[PDB]
Amino acid sequence: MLDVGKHCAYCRQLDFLPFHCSFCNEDFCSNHRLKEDHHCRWLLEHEEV
Numbered sequence: 001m002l003d004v005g006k007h008c009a010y011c012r013q014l015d016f017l018p019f020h021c022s023f024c025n026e027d028f029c030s031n032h033r034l035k036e037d038h039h040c041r042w043l044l045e046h047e048e049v
């Protein structure tokens with residue numbers, strides 16, 4: 001029993017395949033794998049049009 005999956009940092013969902021973001025450096029369930037999903041700081045930093 002060691003690191004049995006990472007829980008989303010937005011909805012807190014225990015997933016087996018945590019999506020690691022190479023922009024904000026955070027784990028998020030597949031459902032929130034997208035950037036905007038977890039409100040990626042990078043997306044907010046550059047939001048035009």
Ligand SMILES: [Zn+2]
Nearest residue numbers: 008011029032
């Ligand atoms: Zn999630």
Ligand SMILES: [Zn+2]
Nearest residue numbers: 021023024040
């Ligand atoms: Zn991100």
